[PDB]
Design a binder for this molecule. Structure first.
Ligand SMILES: Nc1ncnc2c1ncn2[C@@H]1O[C@H](COP(=O)(O)OP(=O)(O)NP(=O)(O)O)[C@@H](O)[C@H]1O
Ligand SMILES: [Mg+2]
Ligand SMILES: [Zn+2]
Ligand SMILES: [Zn+2]
Ligand SMILES: [Zn+2]
Length: 588
């Protein structure tokens, strides 16, 4: 027994065909079952024909007789429909209102999440539906991981190398660092977890959360996480204040964070505040300075990726007392991340943690950085677990989004990423930093006229070290990713002529190209995903292919805006090459 998801009308009915089983009132249950393929209803007992040897679970055929339910063919003459005239028989069959926006609920519950419009509706609906939509999406995504087959240990070559065998009749997941597996040891009458594992193609290379000596017969499946019911909203009700509440501002502040003191005051004058900033404009710098303006306040810094949280940790290292910081890493995951703070010291003034690894705790201010990669599920988790006085949502909708791996056909705008990005595109951000304080003028001019509507201002001047070369090269593939060796050879010859560029960071859309360029060039390699929130003096980027993946403007924007001094872009698509306001080089 619970509350309807479309009315809040008390009811005992749930839809069994919905993969989330939401409470539905008598009218809503009727409105849903008559217009969709969903016909199973769950009350105290599932509505099913009490006739011996009958299968009818469809509520549209069932009738009530005494204390049992019968189908259309096994019903007595005096028997009444369970679902008729617009309602469904159930507890509280009389406190049933009826929603006007049930058309939305039907589309959300029945869509496969392969079109952008399915995600548009999941962000433009009511708040009660946003939580439901995020549950259905995450459950759909987690259910789609079961379509891949099991991988078992066939042969152990060494430690960091394996031979795998694949469960028949099912496809194989892509082998790279993005996809994390779980290993199991087969016991007598059960199965026990061995840790976390990731695989790459050399015979496969492996790294584990443990040093376990995996033997033949152990198996790996994509790590699936529990979909939790969402209670707290994506955004709490907005409260505006008349003075600063709960916080005591500092008397003297450093000259770096002096330009944000007006915005820092606005943070403490309202329940939640949004800061939109183009790349390299000081959004994360804004977040760490907030701690210095409210020295007594306890701030929780969170983001959706371990990379973005590490970026905040690096800045916090420079500006905050190191003995007041902590990095929250989840139990028994090796995944290498910033360990210059105390690890898993939840009761510190400053806490740096990932969204899905958040502990249930209070804070004075909550800072959510890189908001473009967030989802409504993430926003709900943050309000659920972190109870704070102030919520600061920081990010750039024109940077990396959350991976919507089931989204296939169509283009989703940044305005439909999540409810916080929805505010930034409609009513505007509460705060805004419009001056890029990191990249040279050539990069800023490129991204300003490319994606930021010529509204991005540069603080740095032309460094004259931003170069672009047009070489398609030779594209070679292994399964998921791709490799362009001639484009790497261009960098190799370039690296001799510019010896100040072998400390540079190599960026590429494909991480097989990263591995190949790491072996031949021997440079530090970062993916666009792994470079988020980070800045490097010199960046070398090879586009590798002209595929739709490599030509993504947001992905391309993030990659080239990582450089603070110089960048070299080996482009394959002339459309993006000509839109680069760099200096062109000549072929040898
Ligand atoms: N007021 C400031 N004083 C000194 N350095 C600053 C200031 N604002 C920004 N910077 C520097 O400019 C760079 C950009 O800041 P940062 O906060 O990392 O960018 P960002 O807003 O997070 N862009 P992104 O990587 O998309 O998150 C960093 O090197 C900062 O140290
Ligand atoms: Mg940032
Ligand atoms: Zn349903
Ligand atoms: Zn209802
Ligand atoms: Zn029957």
């Amino acid at each position: 027994v619970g509350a309807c998801v479309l009315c809040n009308s008390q009811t005992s009915l749930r839809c069994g065909a919905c993969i989330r089983r939401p409470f539905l009132c008598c009218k809503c249950c009727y409105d849903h079952v008559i217009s969709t393929s969903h016909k199973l209803v769950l009350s105290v007992n599932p509505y099913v024909c009490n006739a011996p040897g009958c299968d009818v679970t469809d509520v549209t055929q069932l009738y009530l007789g005494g204390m049992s339910y019968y189908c259309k063919s096994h019903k007595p003459p005096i028997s009444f429909p369970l679902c008729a005239n617009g309602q469904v028989f159930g507890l509280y069959k009389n406190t049933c209102v009826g929603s006007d926006n049930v058309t939305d609920f039907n589309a959300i519950a029945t869509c496969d999440w392969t079109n952008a419009g399915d995600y548009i509706l999941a962000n433009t609906c009511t708040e009660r539906l946003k939580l439901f939509a995020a549950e259905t999406l995450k459950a759909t995504e987690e259910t789609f991981k079961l379509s891949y087959g099991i991988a078992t240990v066939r042969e152990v070559l060494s430690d960091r190398e394996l031979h795998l065998s694949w469960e028949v009749g099912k496809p194989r997941p892509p082998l790279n660092r993005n996809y994390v597996f779980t290993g199991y040891r087969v016991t007598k009458n059960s199965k026990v977890q061995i840790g976390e594992y990731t695989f790459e193609k050399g015979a496969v290379v492996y790294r584990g959360t443990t040093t376990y000596k995996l033997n033949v017969g152990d198996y790996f499946v994509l790590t699936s996480h529990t979909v939790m019911p969402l209670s707290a909203p994506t955004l709490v009700p907005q409260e505006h204040y008349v003075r600063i509440t709960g916080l005591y501002p500092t008397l003297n502040i450093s000259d770096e964070f002096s330009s944000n003191v007006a915005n820092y005051q606005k943070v403490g004058m309202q329940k939640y505040s949004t800061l939109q900033g183009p790349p390299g404009t000081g959004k994360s710098h804004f977040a760490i300075g907030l701690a210095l303006y409210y020295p007594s306040a306890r701030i929780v810094y969170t983001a959706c990726s371990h990379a973005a949280v590490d970026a905040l940790c690096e800045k916090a290292l420079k500006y905050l007392p190191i003995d007041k910081c902590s990095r929250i890493i989840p139990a028994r995951a090796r995944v290498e991340c910033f360990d210059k703070f105390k690890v898993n010291s939840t009761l510190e003034q400053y806490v740096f943690c990932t969204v899905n690894a958040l502990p249930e705790t209070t804070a004075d201010i909550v800072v959510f950085d890189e908001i473009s990669m967030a989802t409504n599920y993430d926003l709900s988790v943050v309000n659920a677990r972190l109870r704070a006085k102030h919520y600061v949502y920081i990010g750039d909708p024109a940077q990396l989004p959350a991976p919507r791996t089931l989204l296939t056909k169509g283009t989703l705008e940044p305005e439909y990423f999540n409810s916080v990005c929805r505010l930034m595109k409609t009513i505007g951000p509460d705060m805004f930093l419009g001056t890029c304080r990191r990249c040279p003028a050539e990069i800023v001019d490129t991204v300003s006229a490319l994606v930021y509507d010529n509204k991005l201002k540069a603080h740095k001047d032309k460094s004259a070290q931003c170069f672009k070369m047009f070489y398609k090269g030779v594209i070679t593939h292994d399964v998921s990713s791709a490799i362009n060796r001639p484009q790497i050879g261009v960098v190799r010859e370039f690296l001799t002529r510019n010896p100040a560029w072998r400390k540079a960071v190599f960026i590429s859309p494909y991480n097989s190209q990263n591995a190949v360029a790491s072996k031949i060039l021997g440079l530090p390699t970062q993916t666009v995903d792994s470079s988020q929130g980070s800045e490097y003096d010199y960046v070398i980027f090879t586009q590798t292919t002209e595929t739709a993946h490599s030509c993504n403007v947001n992905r391309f924007n993030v990659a080239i805006t990582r450089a603070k001094v110089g960048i070299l872009c080996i482009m394959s698509d002339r459309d993006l090459y000509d839109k680069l306001q760099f200096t062109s080089l000549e072929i040898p």
